[PDB]
Each structure stands twice: as C-alpha cells, then as structure tokens.
Amino acid sequence: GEQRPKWTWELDGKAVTSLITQDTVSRGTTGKGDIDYNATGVLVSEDGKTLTQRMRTMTTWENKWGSRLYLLNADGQNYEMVDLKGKELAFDVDMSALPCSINAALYTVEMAKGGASNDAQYGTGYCDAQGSGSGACNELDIWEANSAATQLAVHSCTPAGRGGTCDTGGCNDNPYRTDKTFYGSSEKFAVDTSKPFTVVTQFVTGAGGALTEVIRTYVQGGKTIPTPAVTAGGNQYTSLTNAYCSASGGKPLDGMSTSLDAGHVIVVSLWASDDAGGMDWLDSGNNGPCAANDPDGAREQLIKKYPEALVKYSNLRITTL
Ligand code: NA
Incomplete structure (x- = not known):
C-alpha cells in the first residue's frame, strides 16, 4: 500500500495535516500505480513540518525527473482546496542546493477538487496557464526559483475552471530585473540563498472582495526585506497591481480573482527543462546571472553535475490578513 507523506502546516494558527500525492505521470502506464516517496526523493521530517524534494534519487531504480x-x-x-484571497501564505525555504536552470516551484492552480475523475489521490487532472483544453486553468506562481533567481507570477485565464484563454507570460516580477544584488547565494545579496529564509505573500482584496494587490516580502536573520520598487510605463510599483500588470504587458488580476473563489490546489513541483535554455525566462539574460542556452542546464546534464540538487520547505502557514 502507498504511504503518502503527512505534511503538517498552519491555517490561522491551527495545525492542519495534508497528505502529499505525486502526479499521475509518475504512476506508470495505468497512471494509478503506487508511489514509493523514498524512491522519488520526497521526505517529510519526523515533526511533520519540513518537506524535502530531491531532483535525482537512486534506490533500486533512479528518479531523474524530480516530482x-x-x-x-x-x-x-x-485535493486540499485553498482560497488565498484576503490571506497571506508564508513558508521557510532552503534554496542553497538549487543551481542555475532548476525550478523549485510552489504554486496554486484551479484544478478540480476530484482531479480528472474523482481520483485526486492519483495526482490526476493537472492544469496550468501553459495548457490547452482540460489542461488550461488559472495559475498563481507564488514561487518559481533557484539559488540565483526568483519569479512571482499571476496567470489570469477567462473563463475560470478548465479550458479558458490564459495569460501564458503572466503578470510577473523578478527582482533581478530591478536590483541584481537583491537575491543570490551570498551575504552580498539582500536575500542570501546560501541560508534559509521566509517567503511571505499577501493576497490583498478590496472591500468588494476582488484581489487588488499581491505583496512579496522576505524574512532572514529576523530582518523583514521588501522587494525593490519596479519601474513600468515610467511609474514605480511595490507589488503586483492591475496598474502594474497593464504597464508591464501582463493581463490584470481579475481572472485570477474569480478563479480563487472556486478553490485552488497547492502544487510543489521541482523540475528542469529537457532543452538547453528552457529555464532562461527565470534566471538568465535580464532575469538572472545564469549562463544562457546552457546544455549543462538541461535536466539530464544538470542531475549529473548536481546529483544532490534539492529544495526544503518548512512551516507552511496560511493566515487571514
Ligand atoms: Na544575466
């Protein structure tokens, strides 16, 4: 029998336990095969608080695809359904084992509570902003990052549910575009990715209940660290707002605002592209310091160069603003 890890997190100060289940793609030809989480490199600590996700794990066979x-x-x-409007989501993270071109993602999508066919336990019914038909839905990329770069993105789709038209680029910010010393793997950066830190995200609503602002802050060494103010259309913005989304060539928050009312699924996905330059949108060019079109950045080479590449998430908390 499959033994799903139990991850204990906090919802308005109360200890909630969820099960961790892996996507159907990893479950063999039926898509309902059992998962050995030790073999896929998915570990929860004894205290139930820390989730470790490895890119590559060798037991009696080799997981080369993260999870x-x-x-x-x-x-x-x-699925454990959340509505993040009027809430903040915070987690502690160790990014120190994540090189250029890997993507440690923690995000929400408007997947059906029951997945594809009332079979969510088999990790079915995945959708995101890059999909088509049943595979297309609103995607809130709270966290897509390695030790070198991070991006926050809202991908509004209309209509809500599955199969709408999606903002594939998203309303997004990467602090490297404004301040190349904000985020990186030494004490020379405002957020030192060689050491653990807290990622805080506020999903601010208006009186009417519409999502109006997404605010990112970091905590490290007890210091609260705001994101650098970003220039778009000659104006400075300190958060994702409809004005910023418009000015930066994204779609506004409104599609996502409607979508979150249906409830979202929390996704934790560690992945690398099979293609050289597949992650350059995240961490190369004006988005980060990483080598562009790096053949070594492709998954098969990355896992050979960095066989211990992994992410740790701790103390997931959702709190009403
Ligand atoms: Na660069």
Missing part, C-alpha cells in the same frame, strides 16, 4: 506533488485532503480522495 510534481499536490496537497491532498486527509480524506485521501480530494
């Missing part, structure tokens, strides 16, 4: 994980309700049949 896409969903938070599953304790019922073991439905």
Whole structure:
C-alpha cells in the first residue's frame, strides 16, 4: 500500500495535516500505480513540518525527473482546496542546493477538487496557464526559483475552471530585473540563498472582495526585506497591481480573482527543462546571472553535475490578513 507523506502546516494558527500525492505521470502506464516517496526523493521530517524534494534519487531504480506533488485532503480522495484571497501564505525555504536552470516551484492552480475523475489521490487532472483544453486553468506562481533567481507570477485565464484563454507570460516580477544584488547565494545579496529564509505573500482584496494587490516580502536573520520598487510605463510599483500588470504587458488580476473563489490546489513541483535554455525566462539574460542556452542546464546534464540538487520547505502557514 502507498504511504503518502503527512505534511503538517498552519491555517490561522491551527495545525492542519495534508497528505502529499505525486502526479499521475509518475504512476506508470495505468497512471494509478503506487508511489514509493523514498524512491522519488520526497521526505517529510519526523515533526511533520519540513518537506524535502530531491531532483535525482537512486534506490533500486533512479528518479531523474524530480516530482510534481499536490496537497491532498486527509480524506485521501480530494485535493486540499485553498482560497488565498484576503490571506497571506508564508513558508521557510532552503534554496542553497538549487543551481542555475532548476525550478523549485510552489504554486496554486484551479484544478478540480476530484482531479480528472474523482481520483485526486492519483495526482490526476493537472492544469496550468501553459495548457490547452482540460489542461488550461488559472495559475498563481507564488514561487518559481533557484539559488540565483526568483519569479512571482499571476496567470489570469477567462473563463475560470478548465479550458479558458490564459495569460501564458503572466503578470510577473523578478527582482533581478530591478536590483541584481537583491537575491543570490551570498551575504552580498539582500536575500542570501546560501541560508534559509521566509517567503511571505499577501493576497490583498478590496472591500468588494476582488484581489487588488499581491505583496512579496522576505524574512532572514529576523530582518523583514521588501522587494525593490519596479519601474513600468515610467511609474514605480511595490507589488503586483492591475496598474502594474497593464504597464508591464501582463493581463490584470481579475481572472485570477474569480478563479480563487472556486478553490485552488497547492502544487510543489521541482523540475528542469529537457532543452538547453528552457529555464532562461527565470534566471538568465535580464532575469538572472545564469549562463544562457546552457546544455549543462538541461535536466539530464544538470542531475549529473548536481546529483544532490534539492529544495526544503518548512512551516507552511496560511493566515487571514
Ligand atoms: Na544575466
């Protein structure tokens, strides 16, 4: 029998336990095969607080593809549904083992609670902003990052549910575009990715209940670290707002605002592109210091150069603003 890891997190100060379940792609030809989480490199600490996700794991066979994980309700049949509007989501993260061209992602999508066919325990029904038909839905990329760069993105789609038209580029910010010393793997950076830090995201609503602002802050060494003010259309912005989204060539927050009312699934996906330059949008050119079109950045080479590449997430908390 499959033994899904239990991840304990905090919802308005109360200890909630969710199950961790891996995507159907990893479950063999039926897509409903059992997962050995030790073999896919997915570990929760004894205290239930820390999730370790490895890119490459060798046991009696070799996991070379990291993992896409969903938070599953304790019922073991439905995804753990969240509505982040008027909430803040915070987690502690160790990014120190994530080189250029890897993507440690923690995000939400408007997947159906039951997945494809009331079978969420098998990690079915995935959708995101890059999909088509049943594979297309609103995507809130809270976290897509390595030790060298990070991006926050809202991908509004209309209509909501599956199969809408999506902003594939998203309303997004990467602090490197404004300040190349904000985020990186030494004490020379405002956020030192060689050491653990807290990622805080506020999903601010208006009186009417519409999502109006997405605010990113970091905490490290007890210091609260705001994101650099970003220039778009000659104006400075300190958060994702409809004005910023418009000015920066993204779609506004409105599609996402409607979508979050349906409930989202929390996705934890550690991945690398099979193509050289597949992650350059995140961490190369004006988005980060990483080598562009790096053949060594392709998954198969990355896992050979950095066989211990992994992410740790701790103390996931969702709190009402
Ligand atoms: Na660069």
